[PDB]
Amino acid sequence: MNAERCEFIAGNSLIEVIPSISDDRPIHLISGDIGPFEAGVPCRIPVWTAILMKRKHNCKVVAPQWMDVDELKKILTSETESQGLAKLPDHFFEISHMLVRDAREDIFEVEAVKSLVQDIYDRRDAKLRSSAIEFLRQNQTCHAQLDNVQLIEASSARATLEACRQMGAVVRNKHESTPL
Amino acid sequence: DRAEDARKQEITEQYLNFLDNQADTFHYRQKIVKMMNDGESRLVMNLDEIREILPERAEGLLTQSVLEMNCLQSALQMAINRSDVQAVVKTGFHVGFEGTFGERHVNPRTLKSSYLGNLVCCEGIVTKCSTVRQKLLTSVHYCPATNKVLEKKFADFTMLDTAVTNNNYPTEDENKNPLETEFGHSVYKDHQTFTIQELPESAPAGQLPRAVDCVADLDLADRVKPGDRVRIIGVFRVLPNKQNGVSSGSFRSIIIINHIQ
Amino acid sequence: VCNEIKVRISQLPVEEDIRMLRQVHLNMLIRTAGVVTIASGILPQLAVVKYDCVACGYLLGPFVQQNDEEVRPTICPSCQGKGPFELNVENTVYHNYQRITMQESPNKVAAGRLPRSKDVILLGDLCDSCKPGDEIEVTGVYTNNFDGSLNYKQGFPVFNTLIHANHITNKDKMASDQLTDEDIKAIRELSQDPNISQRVFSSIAPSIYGHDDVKRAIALALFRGEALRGDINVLLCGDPGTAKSQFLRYAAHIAPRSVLTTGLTAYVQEAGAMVLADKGVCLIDEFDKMSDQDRTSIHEAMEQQSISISKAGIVTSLHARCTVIAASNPIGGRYNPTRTFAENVDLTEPILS
Amino acid sequence: TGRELIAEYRQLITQFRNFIRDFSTGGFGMIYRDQLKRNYFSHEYRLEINLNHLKNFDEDIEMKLRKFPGKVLPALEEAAKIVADEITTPRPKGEEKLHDIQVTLTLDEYPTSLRQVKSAQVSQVVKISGIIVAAAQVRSKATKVTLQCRQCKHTIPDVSIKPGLEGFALPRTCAACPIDPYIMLPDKCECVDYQTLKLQENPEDVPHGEMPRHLQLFTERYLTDKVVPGNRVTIVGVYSIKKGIRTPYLRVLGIHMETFTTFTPEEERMFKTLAQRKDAYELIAKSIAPSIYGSADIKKSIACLLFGGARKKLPDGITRRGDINVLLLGDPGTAKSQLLKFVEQVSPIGVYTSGAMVLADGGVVCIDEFDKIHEAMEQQTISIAKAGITTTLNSRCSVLAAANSMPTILSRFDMIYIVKHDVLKDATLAKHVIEVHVNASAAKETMFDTDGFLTIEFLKKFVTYARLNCGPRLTPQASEKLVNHYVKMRNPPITVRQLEAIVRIAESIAKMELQQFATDKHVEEALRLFRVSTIEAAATG
Ligand SMILES: [Zn+2]
Ligand SMILES: [Zn+2]
């Protein structure tokens, strides 16, 4: 599992667009019907389909509601105050990076949105680092709780799994060395 | 302040219990008995042995070396006072160290300002020597006008003790009677300085070798000559300077020696 | 570009010797001439000063810096008190400064006398305008000031004296190596003629008769190979009185840049003859009368066309890319035709190569 | 009026914080933010800023930073500290202390000539180029100090000192007590590293027939120990006057430099391919000095000199030498110095010269003009006892010597050649050599080279590989031949020195093939080389 496959799974989310082309029938995808398209009237389609239309100039993308600057400030406030990881929308970082990559014309207040997302990422990264360092001093348990971790955050932190597997062998050796 | 006094009492008590444990596992009491039978005045300790029984003292003895070392020497004096043997020596008793240093094993090239105030161990070749000279420590005076005896103590930046005083030589009583020096009762110490340079097997090619200055007192004086290959343990420290109330910010640094190998 | 246009004044009618200045000429304008012996480096000096008032932040000044004073205020008027002072880094102004020493010319000294000397001060765009050894001529104001240590030295209330320079002419400035269209037309018209090679060869040193081999060697050595040394090196050996020095004198006349010397490299206490002759011609007489220090240094210089210097850890090298023409005498006072050139000349084969 | 200066200072800190946070190359690329985070987790408390990027972001603060650096630059360092705290919080336990960060600068402009720094440029940022000529030892400078009164023991803490070669003046009288009563505590002050350097102007820029000029440089913290004498540098710094005449110096804000023992599996496979080849020894001997004709046995001898024998120490402590020494005699021509220069280039460590004997531990020394030390050759040591000194200098090396011609020192050399009627063969050689020089004039107008010879960059690495890894021995059958050869030559000048020299040459030939053992083949080639070299001296003179 890696970051490309995380972005691949994040592509299945739904997002709203405004077409400029028009069409009569629906489109019968294996993942379900999406059409019909009328020019100037919004509708919801998958994110991969939205990016595919945006590259061909066939639509305009409408950003999610959580990309409002006030909503991002609320998220940053909750993340600053809470000791653990705060809850986020699904595929938050992946959808942010995909939309800044392919559709930054349609985002509103782009630099402020970008800076707030970078702030949230920075302090969540610091929280995960501190939690892993404090775990690796442990000897009494082999368990931790990591509520509201994102999939890409979990994917970036797989060294801890290998370290815990190495620690368990030495602990088992001490238990077998205890006399009777 | 009173919390600092309580902590110093605790640290001295811990070192005293280590030195004068009831059944001494490290035999430093028997080494104290050997020291007082031989008339010597400093005791050599293994920092690796302190590290086992009091690691919170041993690792703090590198970072916060001055206060810990003062507390240890005070504990040594109390441990000596518990003996039935008498303290003949008019200078106090002292401590030197040996063992594993790790981070603080250095060269004259790698001694830099991050290490100031720490205990260090350094290696090199002696390149200079001063002759041994005597330095005043305390002065004893008799007042013939009143039959009283006056005493005064002296201190210096090159000494481990941070305390400072006026350092004026006394000549008159508070009632302005004249005074007479008692040379048989005043206290002096032997003093020497030298320098060490990088070993030629370690200095990088083409460049000039770097060097460090050193101060040694009491039984550590008169032990070295030019050309000796030595390993030296002491505290790395900095010395301020003044001229007419204007100070250049560039200060000089030395090693105050505890032990020589 | 600027703040102020200076006026320099030249061709003042009355000249004085350094030897002849009296108390009459104090605060008068005078003109003298002589040879430079010592020159300092260029240093910045205070010109206009302002100070901070520590007590209330007020800026004191401007004070035009006088010649021999530490100008300071004593009272800040904005607080009417003797507040402490600091130098204002942001509003202080500097100018360039240099000091030289000038001696009487040896040609003008009378019988058995010693030449005198004076100190001269240069400010601004007069700095860096002359070297030691230059024949120069100075115009400036002759002034005096008190010095208590000079009083204690001489035992009488004597006064120090100086000249503040206002105009300088350097008599040793070489001509500009720039050509007009008339000069280039003359060069083209000369180069078109078929006899030009014999013209050049025979017209070098026309007073000396014969010795066309020496003339052609000098002529082809004044031009250079293209370059991988490009320089063409020539050595002459001959009996005394055979005019072997006149060739060096004519080469010194005609060469574009030249150093004429006699038996040479840099000196530590300063550039030597080959370093001064870099991308010029180095002419040496008495080449056989060298020392071994000269021989080793010159072998380094001819091998590398550059000379290395090391002193107390400081390590340097200098370029010495020059054409060498040298002259010498044979062993025993006269050449012997029963022996080779390498026997008649005492130089070794690594030098003669 | 201090609140106005406070307002200016806080405004500058706000603007520099905005610059560090908001500058971007497009997308999510905030380069200074990312660089600061990476440096802080790498435990390097520094940052580097480009002034043209700053000029594009905001022209006014850049112009102010150039013209008033001593006023404006601490605000930039403070802004960097604040942004680092924001980026890194919440830090793990034990790492709560916030560190202090040094800011350095780069600037894209033409440098100013060192002779043409105008006096109007004092206390301004300038860019200068030059050569480092000297470098002093690192020393300590105090940043913040604590003062105490001598008599009444009242204290002034955290008195801060301005940077550079500047002193500071103590208070004259007590704040709460004779003239100058304050003293400085040695234990309660803060210190940083500093270094002094000397810069020489480039020799290209010196006007004709003059000496170069010099300038003194001051460096601090991470800019110390970055340069060595001989380096070519460009420097950004503040032009200052040292504390009515003062000398100048430069306080450095940025330096820009204008300029073995480890191998890959590809390199190991290349070395082993050459060792696997049958013609490897002959190929290396051919590869030595291909521009110089002939001299096949001499090139083989130079290969033996480069590789050397094994080095031994028996249980009684008496060591046995591995080095090999070669001497060349005859006429002063025939490119002897060029051969010595080739060996100097190819050898892993080496020197050419006409003391010098000491300077090549593990290396090779080439001596020209040898007709201008016995202890040095045999014992690998020289000794002295003159008035007031006795020492010994010890160093291990091999020696190649060229002469133009003592019979005593011939015992110390393992191989000797006399170089010596060429004219008909020399006609063909003259054709080839002059064609080479005319082709060089036309020019004036990675195991193998184009002509099949080995390259210098591969050969040097291969020698450095082989010396640290091969270490051979002789086979018993190889040992059996030398005893009979020795007895036959001695009972038909034969000595144990010559016997050990032959053993060393056989080990050296077996080293090039990367062998475990030397054999009868290597012994026979060693005997051929020894006879061909040494018997010339027996026949001649
Ligand atoms: Zn005022
Ligand atoms: Zn006081």
Side-chain angles (χ1 to χ4, degrees):
Chain A
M1 198 70 166
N2 58 349
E4 298 290 343
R5 287 167 169 83
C6 292
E7 181 171 313
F8 179 80
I9 289 175
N12 289 336
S13 312
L14 302 182
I15 198 175
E16 178 169 307
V17 304
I18 296 167
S20 61
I21 49 96
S22 288
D23 211 331
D24 53 359
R25 295 141 291 163
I27 306 179
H28 303 294
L29 306 179
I30 296 169
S31 53
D33 305 353
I34 57 167
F37 299 123
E38 182 177 346
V41 174
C43 64
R44 313 195 87 213
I45 56 170
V47 165
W48 68 261
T49 315
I51 282 169
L52 176 59
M53 289 185 72
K54 177 63 188 185
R55 288 175 186 164
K56 295 180 182 299
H57 309 259
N58 288 334
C59 76
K60 172 181 177 183
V61 176
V62 191
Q65 297 292 342
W66 50 262
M67 283 199 163
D68 196 4
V69 176
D70 302 333
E71 302 285 81
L72 288 171
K73 283 177 180 181
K74 289 176 184 171
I75 291 165
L76 180 54
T77 304
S78 180
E79 190 63 67
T80 306
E81 288 181 339
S82 54
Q83 288 282 3
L85 300 177
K87 201 180 180 182
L88 297 181
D90 292 324
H91 314 292
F92 176 82
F93 294 118
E94 295 101 320
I95 290 168
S96 304
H97 278 246
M98 284 189 294
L99 290 178
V100 166
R101 188 192 305 155
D102 262 303
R104 72 181 69 162
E105 186 186 24
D106 296 318
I107 299 172
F108 182 67
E109 309 272 56
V110 187
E111 288 292 324
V113 163
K114 183 192 297 184
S115 185
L116 287 166
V117 171
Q118 186 57 49
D119 281 354
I120 295 161
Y121 184 81
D122 280 322
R123 89 176 298 115
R124 282 179 71 95
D125 182 51
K127 280 183 178 179
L128 274 153
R129 271 169 38 86
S130 302
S131 179
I133 287 169
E134 190 81 335
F135 181 82
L136 286 171
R137 295 162 174 160
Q138 185 64 278
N139 299 147
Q140 318 305 330
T141 51
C142 56
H143 173 253
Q145 183 149 11
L146 299 162
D147 290 357
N148 313 318
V149 67
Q150 297 277 24
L151 180 55
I152 192 161
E153 295 174 320
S155 184
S156 70
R158 299 204 190 277
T160 302
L161 310 173
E162 178 63 27
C164 194
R165 180 160 69 128
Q166 297 303 326
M167 172 61 77
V170 194
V171 173
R172 195 175 307 280
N173 178 71
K174 186 178 70 169
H175 167 261
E176 290 181 323
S177 300
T178 303
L180 286 171
Chain B
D1 308 356
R2 302 185 177 92
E4 315 297 306
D5 298 337
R7 203 184 313 111
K8 286 177 183 183
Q9 287 147 25
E10 180 168 42
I11 291 160
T12 50
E13 183 167 60
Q14 286 161 352
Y15 284 135
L16 177 55
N17 278 271
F18 166 66
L19 287 168
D20 198 24
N21 201 5
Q22 182 168 66
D24 193 3
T25 58
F26 297 102
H27 317 287
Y28 283 110
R29 181 160 67 213
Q30 303 193 358
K31 292 173 180 178
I32 283 164
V33 171
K34 282 195 182 182
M35 175 184 71
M36 292 200 291
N37 274 266
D38 299 329
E40 299 182 358
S41 65
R42 86 172 56 243
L43 179 64
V44 177
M45 303 185 186
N46 279 330
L47 183 65
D48 297 350
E49 285 173 18
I50 309 176
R51 184 167 265 147
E52 298 170 10
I53 192 73
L54 294 153
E56 77 284 5
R57 289 290 138 260
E59 312 307 323
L61 181 53
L62 303 175
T63 58
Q64 203 71 8
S65 60
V66 175
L67 301 180
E68 290 272 19
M69 186 147 50
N70 289 343
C71 288
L72 178 56
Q73 296 200 3
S74 308
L76 176 57
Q77 186 167 27
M78 280 181 282
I80 284 169
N81 282 7
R82 285 179 181 176
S83 179
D84 63 328
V85 182
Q86 281 67 47
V88 171
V89 186
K90 290 178 169 62
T91 314
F93 292 90
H94 302 289
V95 178
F97 295 123
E98 287 182 336
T100 304
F101 290 95
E103 300 178 338
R104 294 109 212 284
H105 189 88
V106 282
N107 288 287
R109 180 167 297 267
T110 59
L111 267 175
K112 286 170 178 175
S113 65
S114 58
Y115 286 114
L116 286 165
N118 298 165
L119 189 75
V120 291
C121 166
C122 182
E123 297 182 297
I125 285 168
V126 181
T127 54
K128 286 200 301 181
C129 264
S130 169
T131 60
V132 178
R133 282 169 290 161
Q134 280 73 39
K135 195 169 181 173
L136 178 62
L137 186 54
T138 77
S139 61
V140 179
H141 301 263
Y142 179 67
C143 190
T146 64
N147 202 26
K148 280 187 175 181
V149 170
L150 178 140
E151 294 191 334
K152 197 172 187 171
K153 305 175 181 177
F154 293 84
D156 184 43
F157 280 8
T158 62
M159 291 170 62
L160 180 62
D161 187 14
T162 186
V164 67
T165 180
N166 295 290
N167 292 0
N168 295 324
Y169 198 83
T171 47
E172 276 83 25
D173 194 12
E174 295 179 11
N175 315 283
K176 303 192 175 183
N177 305 304
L179 299 175
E180 171 180 332
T181 302
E182 292 277 10
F183 294 110
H185 298 328
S186 303
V187 181
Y188 289 78
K189 57 173 181 174
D190 302 309
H191 170 72
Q192 195 181 16
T193 56
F194 55 93
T195 62
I196 55 170
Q197 193 178 98
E198 296 184 78
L199 296 171
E201 294 83 7
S202 299
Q207 302 188 2
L208 281 168
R210 296 181 175 181
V212 165
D213 302 2
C214 302
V215 178
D217 287 354
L218 293 166
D219 59 315
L220 304 174
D222 203 12
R223 280 201 191 186
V224 293
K225 68 176 182 176
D228 298 337
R229 286 186 180 236
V230 286
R231 182 179 289 180
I232 285 163
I233 297 97
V235 175
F236 186 52
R237 209 178 179 185
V238 63
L239 303 169
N241 189 19
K242 291 199 299 178
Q243 286 187 49
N244 302 341
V246 180
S247 175
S248 178
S250 55
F251 298 152
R252 189 172 163 254
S253 61
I254 56 168
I255 301 183
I256 297 164
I257 296 180
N258 293 0
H259 182 45
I260 305 176
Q261 289 185 346
Chain C
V1 184
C2 191
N3 267 298
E4 178 185 70
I5 299 296
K6 293 294 198 192
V7 178
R8 319 291 185 188
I9 291 172
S10 57
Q11 313 200 94
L12 193 67
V14 185
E15 182 173 316
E16 304 282 357
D17 298 1
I18 292 171
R19 185 257 308 190
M20 294 294 293
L21 296 182
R22 300 288 180 268
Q23 61 98 248
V24 178
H25 305 85
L26 296 171
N27 312 291
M28 310 297 288
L29 188 73
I30 57 168
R31 175 163 70 102
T32 62
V35 181
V36 187
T37 58
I38 296 173
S40 73
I42 318 294
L43 300 164
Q45 184 186 231
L46 298 166
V48 179
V49 185
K50 292 186 182 181
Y51 290 95
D52 306 340
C53 178
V54 176
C56 61
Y58 187 72
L59 299 183
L60 307 162
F63 311 104
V64 173
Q65 175 59 46
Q66 290 294 328
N67 301 324
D68 198 20
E69 291 185 36
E70 288 187 45
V71 183
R72 276 187 184 245
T74 49
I75 289 173
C76 168
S78 285
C79 60
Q80 299 290 348
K82 305 177 184 180
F85 305 125
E86 294 282 1
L87 180 62
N88 189 276
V89 181
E90 280 70 22
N91 294 270
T92 310
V93 174
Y94 295 80
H95 53 203
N96 285 337
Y97 165 86
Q98 201 186 9
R99 189 188 185 114
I100 68 174
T101 302
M102 169 179 62
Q103 190 173 87
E104 295 186 77
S105 191
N107 166 64
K108 288 180 171 178
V109 183
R113 309 187 186 176
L114 308 172
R116 303 297 193 197
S117 63
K118 288 287 190 192
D119 281 9
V120 192
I121 290 176
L122 317 178
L123 300 180
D125 50 302
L126 285 173
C127 294
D128 208 355
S129 57
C130 48
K131 290 176 67 179
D134 291 355
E135 263 269 327
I136 64 159
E137 173 180 319
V138 189
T139 299
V141 189
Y142 182 56
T143 58
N144 61 327
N145 69 277
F146 179 69
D147 193 359
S149 190
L150 179 57
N151 192 331
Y152 287 134
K153 277 173 185 171
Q154 302 298 329
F156 286 90
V158 287
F159 270 53
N160 181 62
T161 47
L162 289 173
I163 301 170
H164 299 282
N166 184 62
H167 176 75
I168 296 181
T169 55
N170 194 320
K171 294 159 64 179
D172 287 331
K173 286 280 187 177
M174 285 189 70
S176 182
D177 297 329
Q178 297 289 349
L179 311 178
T180 68
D181 310 81
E182 311 177 17
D183 298 310
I184 295 170
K185 273 183 174 180
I187 286 170
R188 291 286 187 178
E189 286 171 346
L190 268 178
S191 70
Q192 286 154 230
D193 285 2
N195 309 96
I196 185 58
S197 59
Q198 192 166 116
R199 281 187 193 177
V200 169
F201 296 157
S202 75
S203 63
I204 287 186
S207 58
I208 307 176
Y209 209 51
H211 303 298
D212 307 71
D213 307 330
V214 179
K215 294 200 179 198
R216 285 178 301 133
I218 287 173
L220 295 170
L222 289 180
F223 306 97
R224 286 179 74 255
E226 192 54 34
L228 298 177
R229 184 182 82 242
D231 297 283
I232 307 180
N233 291 325
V234 184
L235 172 58
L236 318 177
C237 169
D239 295 337
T242 56
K244 46 87 168 161
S245 302
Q246 292 292 100
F247 280 116
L248 300 183
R249 290 189 178 110
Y250 276 106
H253 288 321
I254 198 54
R257 282 178 50 237
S258 60
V259 172
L260 177 56
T261 185
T262 182
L264 271 65
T265 53
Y267 170 74
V268 176
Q269 176 210 305
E270 189 169 36
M274 297 189 70
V275 177
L276 297 167
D278 176 53
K279 290 201 168 182
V281 187
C282 183
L283 307 168
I284 302 170
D285 208 328
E286 297 173 329
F287 191 84
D288 59 298
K289 305 186 178 181
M290 277 188 296
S291 71
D292 295 328
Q293 187 174 15
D294 301 317
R295 291 176 180 104
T296 51
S297 310
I298 279 160
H299 185 266
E300 164 174 2
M302 295 183 89
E303 164 59 28
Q304 304 180 9
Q305 290 200 304
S306 49
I307 292 160
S308 62
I309 300 98
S310 177
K311 184 66 170 183
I314 299 172
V315 176
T316 58
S317 63
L318 302 166
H319 285 103
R321 305 154 289 195
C322 63
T323 292
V324 180
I325 304 173
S328 60
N329 288 123
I331 302 173
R334 277 218 70 196
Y335 193 91
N336 197 325
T338 70
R339 298 182 171 276
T340 61
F341 190 90
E343 296 165 67
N344 285 274
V345 172
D346 59 350
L347 306 168
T348 62
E349 191 171 336
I351 298 166
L352 289 172
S353 176
Chain D
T1 62
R3 283 177 166 86
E4 305 187 359
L5 307 187
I6 283 164
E8 288 179 19
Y9 186 71
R10 294 292 156 191
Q11 187 70 19
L12 289 175
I13 287 175
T14 305
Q15 291 210 247
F16 285 131
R17 179 179 178 274
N18 288 343
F19 169 73
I20 295 175
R21 279 178 138 263
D22 292 341
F23 186 81
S24 175
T25 61
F28 272 103
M30 276 82 78
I31 53 169
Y32 294 118
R33 189 167 171 169
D34 299 354
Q35 186 197 349
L36 182 59
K37 188 174 179 185
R38 280 192 276 101
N39 283 8
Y40 202 92
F41 292 139
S42 303
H43 308 300
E44 299 189 60
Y45 305 107
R46 58 181 181 84
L47 185 59
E48 188 156 31
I49 282 171
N50 185 276
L51 292 178
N52 288 302
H53 292 166
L54 183 59
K55 183 176 177 175
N56 278 279
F57 192 83
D58 190 5
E59 186 174 20
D60 297 340
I61 53 174
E62 193 268 352
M63 201 183 297
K64 288 177 185 173
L65 176 58
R66 286 209 210 186
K67 289 185 175 183
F68 311 98
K71 182 187 171 185
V72 174
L73 191 57
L76 175 52
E77 297 204 329
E78 182 68 22
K81 190 177 183 180
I82 295 160
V83 172
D85 187 30
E86 297 180 11
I87 286 170
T88 54
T89 39
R91 267 170 277 106
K93 297 179 184 174
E95 299 272 35
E96 295 87 352
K97 186 180 172 182
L98 184 65
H99 283 280
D100 199 350
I101 292 180
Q102 182 180 20
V103 176
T104 59
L105 305 177
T106 65
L107 172 58
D108 315 84
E109 280 181 6
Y110 302 151
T112 299
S113 321
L114 194 137
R115 295 177 179 242
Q116 300 185 261
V117 179
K118 303 176 183 178
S119 64
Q121 298 181 284
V122 178
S123 320
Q124 300 187 347
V125 176
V126 297
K127 185 179 181 183
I128 285 171
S129 182
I131 310 185
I132 300 296
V133 78
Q137 189 178 339
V138 178
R139 294 185 174 100
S140 298
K141 189 194 172 71
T143 302
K144 284 182 175 179
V145 299
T146 304
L147 305 181
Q148 187 163 42
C149 187
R150 187 170 187 161
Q151 300 208 343
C152 72
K153 302 190 176 182
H154 179 63
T155 56
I156 311 174
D158 298 353
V159 187
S160 56
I161 298 172
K162 282 185 177 177
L165 298 176
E166 294 177 15
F168 82 109
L170 295 160
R172 292 293 182 192
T173 49
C174 184
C177 300
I179 300 101
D180 300 336
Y182 280 101
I183 55 167
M184 315 182 70
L185 303 181
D187 304 323
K188 291 184 178 182
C189 56
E190 302 290 340
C191 293
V192 290
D193 302 322
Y194 86 94
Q195 193 177 17
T196 300
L197 314 163
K198 194 167 182 180
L199 184 79
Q200 187 182 84
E201 63 180 332
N202 288 343
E204 307 97 281
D205 295 335
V206 183
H208 292 295
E210 292 186 25
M211 274 177 61
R213 288 177 175 162
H214 307 89
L215 185 69
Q216 183 166 330
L217 315 173
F218 175 88
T219 60
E220 178 191 307
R221 281 182 280 176
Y222 287 93
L223 299 169
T224 58
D225 287 351
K226 268 205 177 186
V227 289
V228 178
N231 292 6
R232 278 183 174 252
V233 288
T234 54
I235 295 153
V236 177
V238 186
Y239 195 66
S240 307
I241 53 105
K242 191 175 171 183
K243 291 199 173 185
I245 311 171
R246 293 91 177 79
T247 52
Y249 78 102
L250 198 85
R251 172 187 157 207
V252 176
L253 301 176
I255 306 178
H256 171 251
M257 281 287 300
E258 299 198 306
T259 297
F260 304 130
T261 326
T262 54
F263 305 98
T264 59
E266 293 184 12
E267 280 160 311
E268 294 218 65
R269 287 164 195 277
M270 283 190 295
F271 297 152
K272 286 171 184 189
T273 302
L274 179 54
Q276 277 147 21
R277 288 180 58 148
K278 281 188 179 181
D279 62 339
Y281 168 55
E282 184 190 313
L283 172 56
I284 292 160
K286 280 171 169 171
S287 302
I288 290 168
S291 54
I292 297 167
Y293 178 80
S295 320
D297 291 314
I298 301 181
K299 289 172 182 201
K300 285 185 162 183
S301 311
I302 289 169
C304 292
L305 184 140
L306 281 166
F307 276 75
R311 196 178 200 270
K312 297 167 196 184
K313 182 177 178 183
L314 295 111
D316 57 0
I318 302 179
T319 57
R320 309 299 164 123
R321 183 163 75 251
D323 288 297
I324 302 178
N325 301 314
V326 176
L327 177 65
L328 308 173
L329 309 174
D331 288 358
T334 326
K336 289 172 167 177
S337 306
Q338 304 304 115
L339 279 163
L340 301 188
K341 289 160 196 181
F342 183 83
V343 175
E344 182 185 25
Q345 290 170 15
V346 167
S347 178
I349 311 167
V351 178
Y352 167 82
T353 186
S354 177
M357 187 75 259
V358 183
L359 317 172
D361 184 23
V364 176
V365 178
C366 306
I367 305 177
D368 209 332
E369 301 171 306
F370 193 78
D371 294 307
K372 279 193 175 186
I373 185 174
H374 299 258
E375 208 192 353
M377 303 288 273
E378 271 278 54
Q379 319 301 328
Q380 318 201 293
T381 282
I382 55 172
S383 314
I384 192 173
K386 300 294 176 69
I389 184 170
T390 177
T391 49
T392 57
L393 302 176
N394 174 83
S395 191
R396 313 167 291 188
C397 72
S398 295
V399 171
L400 176 57
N404 298 315
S405 171
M406 310 87 82
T408 56
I409 207 176
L410 303 181
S411 187
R412 265 64 175 170
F413 282 108
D414 302 302
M415 303 180 80
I416 297 164
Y417 287 105
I418 293 166
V419 168
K420 176 68 173 181
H421 204 71
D422 204 20
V423 288
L424 289 175
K425 314 290 181 178
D426 211 351
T428 72
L429 301 194
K431 286 185 179 180
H432 164 59
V433 166
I434 289 183
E435 276 159 16
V436 159
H437 280 71
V438 172
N439 291 345
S441 300
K444 280 150 56 181
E445 290 271 82
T446 62
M447 288 188 289
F448 298 99
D449 203 1
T450 59
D451 305 3
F453 304 137
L454 301 174
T455 60
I456 280 176
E457 291 85 354
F458 177 71
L459 179 60
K460 188 157 179 173
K461 269 187 170 181
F462 175 55
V463 168
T464 313
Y465 176 82
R467 276 190 168 203
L468 303 174
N469 290 282
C470 187
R473 288 293 193 276
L474 266 73
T475 46
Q477 291 82 12
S479 80
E480 287 179 39
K481 190 186 180 89
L482 292 168
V483 168
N484 299 343
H485 183 250
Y486 188 89
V487 170
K488 281 176 186 187
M489 286 202 312
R490 207 160 217 243
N491 305 267
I494 282 88
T495 56
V496 181
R497 267 190 182 130
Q498 272 67 75
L499 177 58
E500 291 199 295
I502 290 164
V503 170
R504 272 184 285 145
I505 293 166
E507 287 182 357
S508 76
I509 300 173
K511 194 180 289 187
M512 299 178 203
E513 293 176 345
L514 294 179
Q515 298 278 11
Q516 305 295 335
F517 314 115
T519 65
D520 186 48
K521 173 197 181 189
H522 310 86
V523 169
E524 282 188 338
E525 178 63 19
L527 287 164
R528 188 196 68 85
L529 269 167
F530 170 73
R531 283 195 296 109
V532 163
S533 56
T534 315
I535 296 179
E536 295 184 345
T540 315

